[model samples]
Target chain A: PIVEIHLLEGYSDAEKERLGRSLTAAVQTVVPAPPEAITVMMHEMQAADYMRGATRRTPAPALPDAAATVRDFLDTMEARDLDKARTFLTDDFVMTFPTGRRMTDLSDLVEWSATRYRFVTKTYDRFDTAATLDGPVVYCFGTLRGEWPDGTPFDNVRFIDRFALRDGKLAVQDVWNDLEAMRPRG
Target chain B: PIVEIHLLEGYSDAEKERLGRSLTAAVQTVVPAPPEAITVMMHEMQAADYMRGATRRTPAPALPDAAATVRDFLDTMEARDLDKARTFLTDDFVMTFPTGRRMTDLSDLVEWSATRYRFVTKTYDRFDTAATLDGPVVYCFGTLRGEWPDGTPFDNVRFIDRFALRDGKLAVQDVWNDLEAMRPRG
Candidate 1:
């Protein structure tokens, strides 16, 4: 069991402290299994991580090198580091939305930046592995929370990113997630 | 009065013939400068001309030329003319489907043909206008009726084909149409 409890209400500090031991013991009582067989992970997040955007919580993608990419993208987004993320995309790369709308090239991406909501918080999910007919590619999908710079929430986030590798580096990326796809029709 | 009609249901030959005359009269009625201003034609079909596989059809890309390209693709399908359509493509030309499936090279076009359909009747109302975009793009949409080689019948087909022309020859083609997109989703 995890030490951190991302909970709603009702447990004493002592109860929270004893949870890992008690829960494992309770499971062992039923299954007669050893303690090492069970593993629980809890991620504690601020309220801003929950009610601030679309999702209360989302699993971020973190493959060996992928964590680096995500870190690079976020750093660039928040004005920390812009190097790695910009170099990760293909010149002719295409970004498609759930509604079948797409933007091709960096200018299109930059041009559309001012239209509505701003920053793109992309968490790499199981997208660490991408394979083409030739070989290894990077594939990722995760929730995306979009809010206007003025802070208007657009919708829930769910997306997938496909990176085609060339000679071991990211070559072409097809960024997609069908979050807007499963919405009430106009 | 210009023989304009919204989406209409596929009708019988008798109904189609009547609709044709009505369309001609309507055009004449609206373009009242002279009776000679009226010109109309109608073809009863559920679908328009389809641009698939090796086919490329543009609106007035060149009357006989554009028509020839379409007719050629379909004609060769009937005649099994693989060599002919090859002359119309770009060197690295590729034909992509809405299904995201791609058929590269003309031989693939021939190899994939199993269900062959003939245009039982393909007549046009006005003309394959060059109104969409300028230069080398044959932007045309219309209806078509046909019968499969095995006797399956079809009509009222709606489709548009865009061909990229390079050096007086078709370099690439992007098509938008309705065909057997997929199995029904419940």
Candidate 2:
């Protein structure tokens, strides 16, 4: 069977190829057709040509390479390059850490973290992206390696950070990790 | 290169296959690798295991065979089986036709069409489904054939209907056609 997909014309060539292959795989699940038996074609149109309801719609700009953006941001933050790190974020960026701590300014995070630990760093095991209506969401998970507030060493603490993007800028970040449970109780 | 996708469980095997194939295609668009060189894997988890922004999510039930649902509803409507047609719609079902005419009841459509045409029928060229956050949206486009109120015959008047489905029932319909442009100007 042949499947044709019509979409707005913004995806990269790589994205389109993925779409074609995935569609073929999808059809195979329902039919006994071999991979070569299924053909998937794509038709792309300008964003202005599409409408949902009475309104003509234009999609948000294509996101940048999200995994790269996320990794750069993480590295900048770890290096404590406040000004450089700010360049990766939207003006309204917000982030949440454990214990329901919410922050919008990087300086605040710097001051707050001094109380929790001497310093911290992340070693990413994987970075994943999920496309959402607003934009792409990125998740990076791995282990934390750093020192405790008492100057003791700590490592292998699992951590994950979820970052939401808007117009290629990081807009939100939510962090989860095992640091709280691993911290030495006074 | 290998790609792995982690998603909440519930999709059919066909869906999974499609995902795998598409991911492979997407990679090929950027990598210039043979299809055989690309590998895609999927990891599925229960809804409870996935959390977004502190809230657990359960996806809406998989949509019924949208094309079949649409074809059956259209056939029933053309046959003037109002009672049966109503069974395919949600209680809040609403439809909008050319000139922005909106109707919630099937009987209202029957009454409204009396002065416009003796009857109308559709010859479907295609039915397409787009998965959205709310549910699946189905679009059927075709040509119309019937007689006008003056008993003049009309054929090949292009028409398109967009139907939004929720919980396996039609919730909204938006129609566009050339009938108004082709109508005789008095």
Candidate 3:
């Protein structure tokens, strides 16, 4: 089976690739054919040549690669490089971590974490990115590993971070993890 | 292989189906697998829960079925039901045909056709619909059949019509045909 899409041109190569992959997956749900047997084609036209309700239409600009940006930021944070990590964030950046701890400054987070652990790092399993009207978001999940305040080691505490990007800068971050649930109780 | 998509909510069922199909096709280009072996899953979140650039996002409403609407309008025109055909068009509807003839009224098209042929009808082979910022467009191409001037029967003359729909009503039409090239020369 062959599927041809007529689209108003403007999407980037990455966006088009993602779209094609998504379409291929969709066809599999109903057709038993192999991916090799199914072909997909895209025909792009100028925005001026396309209309939705008698008005000309143009697509929005594609967002930057959120997954890569988020990955870099995470790595910087894990390395405890506050100056480098600060470069990845927007002026209005904010973060909400587990235990209802919300902070806007990286230094504040570092100060707060001193009471809980000597150092912490992440081992990423995967990162997923999605586009929204406002921008793109990247969600990364993995295990956390590091030392406790008592000089004890911990590893594999499940964690997920949701990061929002605007103009290619991190605008917001939300973190969830099993650290609190697995905390050592005296 | 498994592919998961995180989407901001609000798309209709048909829209999601189309999206899924598109994504599936995209994956096939990079991964060689049977459609049956690849599984696609979608996780939708509310607009508020999903943010890009620290701002909430929402999707635009899906356009109506342009192919169906255009098909109905063509069928009505073929039946010579001028009154019914008129209902399919917007008040400001205009059509530009081969030889640069521009018309706004259906009656004008009928009157104009009398000078070139006894009557004319279309046999559509395919209709391709595309979304534009202005409106949705439907392009139909096939052959023309009927009698030319002097009662000479004519068939298999290739033709294509591009129709623009505004709020579910036909707002504009542009036509191209081989009628003049194949016209009977005395």
On TM-score, the candidate that comes out on top is 3
Give the number of the best model, judged by lDDT: 2
Error of 1 at B156 (Å): 1.9
Residue A81, model 1, lDDT:
40
Instruction: Give me the runs in candidate 3 sitting further than 4 Å from their true place.
Output: A1-15, A23-39, A46-61, A130-135, B1-186
Model 2, clash count? 13
lDDT by residue for model 2 (A86-165), tens? 99999999987655467999998888878888988888866545433344556666678899988999987666677877
Looking at model 1 chain B, which ten-residue stretch has the lowest summed lDDT? B126-135
Query: Interface RMSD (C-alpha) of each candidate?
Result: 33.9, 18.7, 23.5
lDDT of 1 by residue, A114-182 (tens): 553465566543323311123234444445666756665654355544444433334554443333232
TM-score of 3: 0.45
User: Candidate 1 DockQ category?
Assistant: incorrect
lDDT of 3 by residue, A75-140 (tens): 888888899999999999999765446799999999988887787789886554432324345666
Query: Could you tally the backbone clashes for each prediction?
Result: 21, 13, 27
In candidate 1, residue B29 scores what lDDT?
15
Q: Give the best candidate by DockQ.
A: 3
Candidate 1 B-chain TM-score: 0.46
Give the per-residue lDDT of model 1 (tens digit) for B65-110: 4434555554554565667767666687776433333577767655
List DockQ, one per candidate, in order. Answer: 0.01, 0.02, 0.03
- lDDT-wise, the better of 1 and 2 is 2
